[PDB]
Amino acid sequence: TNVYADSFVIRGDEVRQIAPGQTGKIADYNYKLPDDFTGCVIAWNSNNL
Amino acid sequence: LSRLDPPEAEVQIDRLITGRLQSLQTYVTQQLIRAAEIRASANLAATKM
Amino acid sequence: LSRLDPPEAEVQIDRLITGRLQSLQTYVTQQLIRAAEIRASANLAATKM
């Protein structure tokens, strides 16, 4: 129910940090992943564009 | 609280809950065991009196 | 079943088993506690009759 897609582009140095419950430069002050949240995260490199 | 974040400390909290609940069930069992022991004794004392 | 694959859901199944087995042991203990309470009462009623 109610599929929401949050899309952005980041450097590979912070890709491993985005996860629901940790800290960091981006995880603390740019977005908040809830701890009880259930979902999926997909990251893929895009050099051609 | 000051030793881990809620996610990973949750498993230690679970062990704390389990051990203490089982300590309570042993204690309550023994309390009612001695209560039942005193039950027959109290009926015995009522019969004597 | 529809919520995780068997490997990682196994740990939640273990908690489900543990809580329910302990609920049974408490319930069975209390049942026999009241059975023993009724034991002396029934011998008492047999003595009266």
Curated annotation (Swiss-Prot), chains B, C:
Effect of L1F: In strain: Omicron/BA.1
Domain of life: Viruses
Biological function: Subunit of the fusion protein that is processed upon entry into the host cell. Mediates fusion of the virion and cellular membranes by functioning as a class I viral fusion protein. Contains a viral fusion peptide that is unmasked after S2 cleavage. This cleavage can occur at the cell membrane by host TMPRSS2 or during endocytosis by host CSTL. In either case, this triggers an extensive and irreversible conformational change that leads to fusion of the viral envelope with the cellular cytoplasmic membrane, releasing viral genomic RNA into the host cell cytoplasm.
Entry protein name: Spike protein S2'
Species assigned in the record: Severe acute respiratory syndrome coronavirus 2
Taxonomic path: Viruses, Riboviria, Orthornavirae, Pisuviricota, Pisoniviricetes
Covered residues, full protein: 981 to 1029 of 1273
